[PDB]
């Protein structure tokens, strides 16, 4: 909000606060920018005049991010989580570095250990190598170093290594995110054959990706957010079945719920993930994620500390599900007697054409 920013290292920035052609003077490196969250942090910096370094793995995927900025603002770098030089040279000029990189499943090239540990290691070591001012690590909700979930385990261990080498790390633990192009509402919207093993009984606090994207901007703009952990989540407790009925109440969709017990589902989950090359939405570790419930850290800062209000998901379902609404002239209600009379003032056939 101020026109002067003294970075944590000490250099001053004199920003002019406008739009695309302005001077935000922040240089940013967003790791994990081609997913669903990164396009909100990238667009927010770029549309206010800041340079955003966007490391990418695939050329095609990254293309939608350049529209948000003026010439010289979105710089694309070809990077690999196992090539340190690509990481090193992506962060040498950056003021703030973000790390949004994360999978929910193991691959043939990355175990949840490789992604969340060996990448955070490789990346934060570069942040410490160049004395970058702010380093913001997006972790997960329910992150805990000793967890049966490899996702909650390996993402919880990254939080350790982040501050072991960079003590001034912001941690951001977002709840399952929702909105446009998500895997929460769009999953309930799109899939038909759905497999679970805990009766869709997950309870959590769904948060809009858009406040998460806006919140990550404000951690850059407040120097007091440096070195503490945040818990971003929505205002109301929700269960997946309660979330689904909202999707159900808007779109009127019928889906198959199979709900196979945990012993016969998890060993099978690994197999499907090991032979199908796309994200099938169920894997071994993802099923274990079903049994936990979100527990809010009481020692961690929240939206309010950033001057923000979360919104619930009920106020947004109609917006993000309206495109998925098959409504033709067929599905309309039976007509009333008043309008049936109106039809007698028209001829409904053209007998001369």
């Amino acid at each position: 909000i101020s026109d002067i920013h003294i970075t944590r290292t000490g250099k001053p920035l004199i920003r002019i606060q406008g739009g695309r052609s302005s001077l935000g003077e922040h240089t940013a490196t967003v790791f994990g920018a081609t997913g669903q969250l990164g396009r909100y942090i990238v667009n927010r910096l770029a549309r206010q005049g800041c340079t955003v370094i966007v490391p990418y793995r695939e050329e095609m995927a990254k293309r939608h991010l350049k529209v948000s900025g003026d010439l010289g603002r979105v710089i694309f770098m070809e990077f690999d989580l196992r090539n340190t030089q690509s990481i090193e040279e992506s962060v040498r000029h950056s003021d703030v570095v973000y790390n949004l990189i994360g999978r929910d499943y193991p691959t043939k090239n990355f175990s949840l250990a490789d992604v969340h540990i060996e990448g955070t290691e490789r990346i934060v070591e570069a942040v410490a190598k160049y004395d970058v001012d702010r380093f913001i690590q997006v972790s997960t909700y329910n992150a805990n170093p000793d967890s049966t979930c490899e996702f909650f385990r390996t993402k919880g261990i990254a939080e350790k290594v982040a501050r072991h080498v960079f003590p001034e790390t912001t941690i951001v633990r977002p709840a399952p995110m929702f909105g446009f192009e998500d895997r929460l509402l769009l999953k309930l919207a799109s899939v038909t054959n759905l497999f679970t093993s805990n009766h869709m009984r997950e309870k959590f606090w769904p948060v809009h990706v858009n406040e998460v994207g806006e919140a990550l901007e404000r951690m850059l703009y407040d120097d007091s957010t440096a070195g503490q952990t945040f818990e971003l989540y929505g205002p109301r407790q929700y269960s997946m079945a309660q979330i689904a009925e909202l999707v159900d109440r808007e779109i009127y969709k019928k889906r198959r719920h199979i709900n196979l017990p945990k012993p016969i589902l998890q060993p099978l989950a690994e197999l499907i993930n090991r032979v199908l090359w796309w994200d099938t939405g169920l894997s071994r570790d993802q099923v274990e994620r079903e049994f936990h419930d979100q527990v809010i850290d009481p020692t961690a800062k929240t939206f309010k500390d950033l001057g923000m209000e979360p919104t619930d998901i009920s106020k947004w379902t109609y917006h993000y599900l309206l495109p998925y609404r098959p409504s033709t002239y067929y599905d309309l209600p039976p007509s009333t007697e008043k309008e049936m009379r109106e039809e007698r003032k028209y001829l409904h056939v053209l007998d001369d054409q």
């Binding site: 039976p334 007509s335 007697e337 049936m340 039809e343 007698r344 028209y346 001829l347 409904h348 056939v349 007998d351």
Partner: protein, 87 residues
């Protein structure tokens, strides 16, 4: 036995129809396809060509009722704007 079942289907189209004057149009033709089909299968049994011919003339009268039936239904729709039966 298939001929009788398919006759029932046309009958049952009249049993379950409170609103579709189009299904009443349809079931009459299912009933005609039963009777023509029965005539044909008995003609194969008796080595008679007259059963085949009688089927042909049933098919030609059946198409003509469709023209008269869809023509009259057009005349009705032009002044009504609905094929629905209030109930």
């Amino acid at each position: 036995n298939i001929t009788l079942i398919l006759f029932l289907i046309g009958i049952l189209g009249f049993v379950l129809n409170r609103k579709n004057i189009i299904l009443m149009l349809i079931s009459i033709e299912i009933m005609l396809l039963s009777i023509t089909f029965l005539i044909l299968l008995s003609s194969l049994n008796m080595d008679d060509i007259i059963g085949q011919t009688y089927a042909i003339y049933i098919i030609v009268v059946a198409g003509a009722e469709s023209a008269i039936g869809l023509g009259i239904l057009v005349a009705f729709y032009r002044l009504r704007g609905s094929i629905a039966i209030e109930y």
